[PDB]
C-alpha cells in the first residue's frame, strides 16, 4: 500500500 515513511 502507499506509505509516507517511518514514524519510530
Amino acid at each position: 500500500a502507499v506509505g509516507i515513511g517511518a514514524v519510530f
Epitope: 500500500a1 502507499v2 506509505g3 515513511g5 517511518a6 514514524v7 519510530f8
Partner: antibody, heavy 122, light 108 residues
C-alpha cells in the same frame, strides 16, 4: 481514549484562505499518518492528502497540489490544513483521520475528527 | 485515479436480513481496501481493512471478502443500528479514492 478534535466552523469569501486544525489526544501523535478528507453536502468522500507527523512529509492529491498545504506542530500534537484560493466548490465538511498505519503503510482510517464546516461564498 | 463502483447504491431491508454490497475497482488494488459505515451528521467509522480483517469494536455480523477488482461486504442478521451508508476505499496508489456509497434503509 484516542480522539482527534478539530477547530470550529469557518466562513470565507472566494479567493481567501482557511486553516483548519486537528489536535490528537490519547495516543502518540507522531506514531500514525494523518489524512485529510472532505465531504460536500449530499456527496461522498474526497481525499485531500496525508501527512507523516513525525517527519512532516506529505502527499497531496493532484487536484489540490499547489493550493492545499499540510503541516504539524509536535509541541501541541496538532496538524493543520491550509486551503488557499478558495471557491464555492470548497464548501464542505473537512475531516482529519488517523491511519492505523501498520507497517508504515496505509491500512484504514480508524479515528476521525468531528469535522469542520467550511462555507465559501460571495 | 481508481474508480470504485458500489452496487446497489440504495437498498431497503428488514431487521434480521442479510445484505451483500459489492465494490468493483477499475484496476486491481490487491487487498488494499477498507470499508466504512457513516450515519447522518457523523464521521465514518472503519469496519474492515486489508479487504477482510474486521476492525476491533465491530460486531461479527460484519464480514468481507475479495481481492483484485471485486470486493464484497456482507452484513448478516441486520440490526436497527446498521441502517446507514457504507463506503469502500482503496489505498493501493495515489490518490486514495472512495466508492460512491450504498445507503441501507429500513422497510415498512
Amino acid at each position: 481514549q484516542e480522539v482527534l478534535v478539530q477547530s470550529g466552523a469557518e466562513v470565507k469569501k472566494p479567493g481567501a484562505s482557511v486553516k483548519v486544525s486537528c489536535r490528537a489526544f490519547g495516543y502518540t501523535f507522531t506514531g500514525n499518518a494523518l489524512h485529510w478528507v472532505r465531504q460536500a453536502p449530499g456527496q461522498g468522500l474526497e481525499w485531500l492528502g496525508w501527512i507523516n507527523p513525525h517527519s512532516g512529509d506529505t502527499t497531496t492529491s493532484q487536484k489540490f497540489q499547489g493550493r492545499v498545504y499540510m503541516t504539524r506542530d509536535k509541541s501541541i500534537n496538532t496538524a493543520y490544513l491550509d486551503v488557499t484560493r478558495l471557491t464555492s466548490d470548497d464548501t464542505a465538511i473537512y475531516y482529519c483521520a488517523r491511519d492505523k498505519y501498520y507497517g508504515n503503510e496505509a491500512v484504514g482510517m480508524d479515528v476521525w475528527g468531528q469535522g469542520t464546516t467550511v462555507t465559501v461564498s460571495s | 485515479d481508481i474508480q470504485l463502483t458500489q452496487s446497489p447504491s440504495f437498498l431497503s431491508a428488514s431487521v434480521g436480513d442479510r445484505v451483500t454490497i459489492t465494490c468493483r475497482a477499475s484496476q486491481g488494488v490487491r487487498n488494499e481496501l477498507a470499508w466504512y459505515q457513516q450515519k447522518p451528521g457523523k464521521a465514518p467509522n472503519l469496519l474492515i481493512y486489508y479487504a477482510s480483517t474486521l476492525q476491533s469494536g465491530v460486531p461479527s455480523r460484519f464480514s468481507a471478502s475479495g481481492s483484485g477488482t471485486h470486493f464484497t461486504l456482507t452484513v448478516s442478521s441486520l440490526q436497527p443500528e446498521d441502517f446507514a451508508t457504507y463506503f469502500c476505499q482503496h489505498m493501493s496508489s495515489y490518490p486514495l479514492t472512495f466508492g460512491g456509497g450504498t445507503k441501507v434503509e429500513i422497510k415498512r
